[PDB]
């Protein structure tokens, strides 16, 4: 039927940081994944639970497009079962995951000369983040016996740490925006289907 809003997700000039990932509900769209699959801009297109070529002709119950930014090294933290600081704390894709994670180098897009620190991750947390959830809580973390009393002190830390993104650095430090196309809820009539 109507045209898909898929362009807005990929072409959005701004992606929120990984700790608070923007989740875009998708409805009334035409599943035109042919352009995406034929695109040579996407460095990583590793789909889990579905084949990349089958995306063009398939009916999707509901699509959630969660987008964020990750450092150049360890872009594959998003892959289910992969444990790391950003994976365990900021965004944890559930081990049983049904969707395609697509990520590409955004150094020319999301990196500024001298550093762009707008994207930041929660380095410290009391417990590992529950799967597919967001915790924007920014209280002072307590790493000591003394109660921090909501106050930053010795053995007390802020949870969020900013990324180091420099255009000069190569594959080590480059903004690699990730768009996790989690879909196929299988809970309602499908509003997304392949073109006919």
């Amino acid at each position, epitope marked *: 039927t109507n045209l898909c809003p898929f362009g807005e997700v990929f072409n959005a000039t701004r992606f929120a940081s990984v700790y608070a990932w923007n989740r875009k509900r998708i409805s009334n769209c035409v599943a035109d994944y042919s352009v995406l699959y034929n695109s040579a801009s996407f460095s990583t297109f590793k789909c889990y639970g579905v084949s990349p070529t089958k995306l063009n002709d398939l009916c999707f119950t509901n699509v959630y497009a969660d987008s964020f930014v990750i450092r150049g090294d360890e872009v594959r933290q998003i892959a289910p079962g992969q444990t790391g600081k950003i994976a365990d704390y900021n965004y944890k894709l559930p081990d049983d995951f049904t969707g395609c994670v697509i990520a590409w180098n955004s150094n020319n897009l999301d990196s500024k000369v001298g550093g762009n620190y*707008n994207y930041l991750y929660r380095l410290f947390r009391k417990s590992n983040l529950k799967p597919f959830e967001r915790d924007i809580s920014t209280e002072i973390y307590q790493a000591g016996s003394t109660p921090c009393n909501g106050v930053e002190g010795f053995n007390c830390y802020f949870p969020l*740490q900013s990324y180091g993104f420099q255009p000069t650095n190569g594959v080590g430090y480059q903004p690699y925006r990730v768009v996790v196309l989690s879909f196929e809820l299988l809970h309602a009539p499908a509003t997304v289907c392949g073109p006919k």
Partner: antibody
Amino acid sequence: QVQLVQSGAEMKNFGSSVKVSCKASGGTFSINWVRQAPGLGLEYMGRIIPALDRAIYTQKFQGRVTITADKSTSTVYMELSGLRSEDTAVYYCARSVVGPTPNYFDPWGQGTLVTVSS
Amino acid sequence: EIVMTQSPATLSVSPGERATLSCRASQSVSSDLAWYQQKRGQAPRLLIYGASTRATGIPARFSGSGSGTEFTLTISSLQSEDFAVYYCQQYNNFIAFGQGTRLEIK
């Protein structure tokens, strides 16, 4: 190069509150509060992230210091309700990369001298 | 409760090729030091945002060094202007300012 410009009241009487704010350049860089007693070691009061508007204080300065953020001009204010005779200390506005600890103060602010008249 | 004790607080050197400054910690520091140049009647400026990686400005001839408990700073070109109070700073655990090391022309 150019320090973050800050404005603050000077020579307030006892019991008054000084409101000092600095203009952030722009971004998610945290703004941290550094108190320097005259001819003594520097001290750290707290911080507030401008983007997230999160309040951070120190056990030494809990309650006495209050920090507010004005998003329109991207300025973060500092109100100090209780003033003491020894509290006549310059309060520095420092921009640092937001981290679990206040990172390197790159760069510092102008620096506002405050004196107390008993 | 980490205090950045500085042993040569009154360190003083006449202009020369070599200058030595020191900084110590009560507990282990994972090379998260910083040096701030606080000139007389001036706002401080960052010098070594890393443990030894000098700043993006013009800290030419200024070189951090050391890791762990012991830290040191050396400068090849001791000009008159750069003479100031250098405040060792540690943020491995919490923001902890050293008492400060004045530098004099003695």
